[PDB]
Every structure is written in structure tokens, then in C-alpha cells.
């Protein structure tokens, strides 16, 4: 699909077989989801950007479907204000910027 | 061009006569540059990011050339960690996401 940028590029994702809305964010190295009680082992991590850093939990090899495209990789969880799909998963679904 | 996302999507811009490197950022509503001088009137504004809120200076109707494409629009200047081209200008240069 082609997603224009007039509005925030929010799409449906599936993690755990369940659906969420997430922002396709070419300005994010990593994927970070709003706080959710995901099972599995995790490691603490700090992620930063405008306004400083937040503490998150890093989960590895988590399957995630993005607009019907399967992906699997590292998923961070913490107090982000919006679910964010970063480049680690954007590359897996073959996403490009085009102009 | 078509830009893949295995690396940060960094491009050269020209603004106020000067060259800089900036990140093409679909996760940003606005364009935010690191501290610099720009001519003309500015307004104090605040914006949010992953870590919280920061203070910026808003310059309106600023010409900016992005990877060879012309835009004229709002540029925010403040303590961002990286120069960011957001959707306000990505739309002007005809940028879309594709997968």
C-alpha cells in the first residue's frame, strides 16, 4: 500500500493475535508499544528522543503483523504515548520512503 | 528517490543559506532543527516527544530545500537531538510510505 503523510500514518497491527493502532515512524530506530502485560523474558532499556528518555522493557523475537505483513523482532514496551513501529520492523515489511 | 530503512533516512538540506543533515521523520508532525539562527520573527512554542515536552522557536514560511526538493513552511528550532524533517514538509516534497 501507499500511505500519504497528510495525517499521522497510523495503521492496524496485531500482536498476540490482538489488534492495536500504531504509528509508522521512520524517525524511530526501534519499535515501542504502549504499556501492556506481555508474557516472556525481558531486559530493561532506556530510549530517548525529544524531551529526554523513558524506561522500557525489551522483549525479543515477538511476532507482530503490520497491515497484514508478518514481522518478528524486538519489541519495547513502556510509557510511550502512542504505539510506534520503528525501522527494525519497517525494514521487515519492505517499507520505503518515496518522493 | 526511493529510500530503504536499514539505516536512518538522513539527507542534506539547505536553510537560511546553510547546509545541514536531517532525518526524514514520518513520526513527527513538525520540522524541528537544532539550535541555529534564522531570520525574521519567531514565536515561542512547546512540542512533545518520546521523553516529554520542550520549548522551541517557531519560524513561519521558511524556504528549505530537502534533498533537492523545495519546500516553504514552518520550522521549529530548539533542543532536539537530531534535525528532523516532519510531515509538514514531507508532504510538500511529495513523500509517501510504501510497502
Amino acid at each position: 500500500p501507499q500511505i500519504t503523510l497528510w495525517k499521522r500514518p497510523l495503521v492496524t497491527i496485531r500482536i498476540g493475535g490482538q489488534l492495536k493502532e500504531a504509528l509508522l515512524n521512520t524517525g524511530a530506530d526501534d519499535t515501542v508499544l504502549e504499556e501492556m502485560n506481555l508474557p516472556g523474558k525481558w531486559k530493561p532499556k532506556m530510549i530517548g528522543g525529544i524531551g529526554g528518555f523513558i524506561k522500557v522493557r525489551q522483549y525479543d523475537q515477538i511476532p507482530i503483523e503490520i497491515c497484514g505483513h508478518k514481522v518478528i523482532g524486538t519489541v519495547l514496551v513502556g510509557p510511550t504515548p502512542v504505539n510506534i513501529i520503528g525501522r527494525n520492523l519497517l525494514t521487515q515489511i519492505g517499507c520505503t520512503l518515496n518522493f | 528517490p526511493q529510500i530503504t530503512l536499514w539505516k536512518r533516512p538522513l539527507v542534506t538540506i539547505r536553510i537560511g543559506g546553510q547546509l545541514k543533515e536531517a532525518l526524514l521523520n514520518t513520526g513527527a508532525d513538525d520540522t524541528v532543527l537544532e539550535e541555529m539562527n534564522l531570520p525574521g520573527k519567531w514565536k515561542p512554542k512547546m512540542i512533545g516527544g518520546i521523553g516529554g515536552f520542550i520549548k522551541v522557536r517557531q519560524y513561519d514560511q521558511i524556504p528549505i530545500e530537502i534533498c533537492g526538493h523545495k519546500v516553504i513552511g514552518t520550522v521549529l528550532v530548539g533542543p532536539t537531538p537530531v534535525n528532523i524533517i516532519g510531515r509538514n514538509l514531507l508532504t510538500q516534497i511529495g513523500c509517501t510510505l510504501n510497502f
Binding site: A28, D29, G48, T80, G86 | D29, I50
Partner: peptide, 10 residues
């Protein structure tokens, strides 16, 4: 390094 450049108006 800082690496999540979410940015929102308001």
C-alpha cells in the same frame, strides 16, 4: 543513543 524521534504538536 537517542533514537526515537516521535514528535507531536501541542
Amino acid at each position: 543513543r537517542p533514537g526515537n524521534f516521535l514528535q507531536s504538536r501541542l
